[PDB]
Amino acid sequence: LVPMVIEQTSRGERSFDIYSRLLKERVIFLTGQVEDHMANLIVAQMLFLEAENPEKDIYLYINSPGGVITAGMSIYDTMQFIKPDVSTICMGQAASMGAFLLTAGAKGKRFCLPNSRVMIHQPLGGYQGQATDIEIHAREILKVKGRMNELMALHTGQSLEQIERDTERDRFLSAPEAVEYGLVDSILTHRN
Template identity: 65%
Template sequence: MNLAKANFHKTDKEAYSMNLVPTVIEQSANGERAYDIYSRLLKDRIIMLSGPIEDDMANAIIAQLLFLDAQDSEKDIYLYINSPGGVITSGMAIFDTMNFVKADVQTIVMGMAASMASVLASSGAKGKRFALPHAQVLIHQPSGGAQGQQTEIEIAAEEILKARKMINELLAKNSGQPIEKINKDTERDNYLTAQEAVDYGLLDGIMTNSSEKQ
């Protein structure tokens, strides 16, 4: 979880991965229609939050949340999370939108929900926050770097402290744990198994198959 805006440059590997996005062909009375897999999942109200959280990714997630809510605010939205975390402001933009929309947002952790992603995973609709059996959750305090004059370094340090207070208060609210425990447990990297995340109160249950979605 980082305070600073990050500049993410697409590497050759990332560009290669983008070319591997499958295309789904569907038959209809009007003929064939091709979708990329993410657009097809969106038809089923599924949003994939995968990879580092930064502005471009956050804007895409936000747009999908708003679209699905406008389409039908009575039906749940399913947010699948596999992310190492990222920029706090980008994550908070997603968080605020999850609360802004009328539709319940179910969260399902697969793989890892680390740092800012753990906040989002625990911020799904109460009773609808899940993990797959071998998923992990990582909570810790924000990090950031600063350089320049002493005043600038002091300002950056103060912002990190503000961010930590905000994040820990959200984790306390989402989990039901006392803020003192959250402060202690996020001093260092704190890895939780799916069951441990449920016991801690960050999630509500472990999902073993898609039929268990509510």
């Protein structure tokens, strides 16, 4: 169940669901595994908020263990296309693709809550079939791995060689270490 809230306006009272209420204030939630359907919904929200106001920041709240890459790159490419600065915040955790969408936010507007945790690794995949087809799909996921490391280096500021060494295996980063690593910019410990 999803609670319903009421917004007071000049015309009259208005009934909203809680997630649609926050969308009115330019807040998007990225929850759970990243798949084609949920990601296609986040794209629709970003495009809508750009049209409603292209000069006001969009906020993307991330609590996800990651998922499909191609579904996540649809979110990434949209964030870079649109004019508004997509601020990203990590709540709970932001793993493999969730961490890539976290660091892909606008520079200076990427945050981590004080006890959140970030995880980064290299792409996972697989194939079954002839050796000629295994070579094709093996070359492809390596190109994806190279592309994801270049973009990680671009946004984090690190070198491509450093990103390659750290993402060969799973690497957990606390919220302070994510700041030092360039993955996020600061921490929202308390409200001021």
